[PDB]
């Protein structure tokens with residue numbers, strides 16, 4: 252049922268989407284050991300998850316002071332939105348992973364290293380994504396079906412994941428956070444452009460759907476960065492990802508709070524994973 256719009260507008264999920272759905276995806280608490288020691292994450296599996304099918308996968312990072320349990324906690328309840336959207340056909344079934352930048356030497360800035368070496372192989376060896384194997388080659392070969400996003404300091408994580416992991420990830424959802432690399436918006440945009448240049452990828456092979464609230468403090472630093480990125484040839488600004496690859500959704504009145512930011516995921520996640528997808532769909 253999903254069709255791309257070229258300038259999608261903010262729309263909260265209905266209030267009923269915040270209550271439990273009978274078609275509930277399973278959430279699995281996992282523990283693994285990597286370069287930052289023994290750590291945990293949650294894996295949301297869609298209702299009807301079949302390991303003999305292949306699922307898109309979206310990794311989603313919490314904000315400062317939060318943890319791997321926050322996004323599926325009572326303070327956010329993102330799983331209820333996921334369950335309802337998948338059941339109603341708004342969102343194709345996917346795996347959603349909530350890891351953490353806490354623990355050991357890990358930070359919001361450096362998490363991408365653990366993401367590459369430990370998180371992707373742990374999760375994607377266990378669960379059925381488009382990765383046929385979890386060697387670097389297997390991960391890279393399935394990059395069009397892998398996304399990363401996050402809120403606030405997790406938005407910063409997302410930008411560092413983008414710059415350092417274009418080989419592994421095609422879709423990016425930075426929420427209420429900017430990219431801290433640079434002394435001007437142009438430095439930030441140029442770093443992203445250089446990463447794209449180095450990757451060799453075409454403009455049809457990476458996608459950025461950024462979002463924040465018009466009353467969210469992070470807008471102050473995101474907006475200049477977004478404007479500098481718009482000026483790059485590397486980005487074609489539109490939410491219609493059949494035609495371009497870059498959008499910035501600004502929710503009127505919304506403040507720096509998961510209560511709003513969960514709706515940005517509701518609005519944006521349905522836009523992901525249709526370019527070079529393996530099903531025959533018309534969006």
Ligand SMILES: COC(=O)c1cc(OC)c(O)c(OC)c1
Pocket residue numbers: 314315403404406407427428429430468469470471472473
């Ligand atoms: C609590 O505030 C933040 O996390 C935050 C993060 C940002 O980028 C990662 C911001 O740009 C920001 O602007 C006020 C605030």
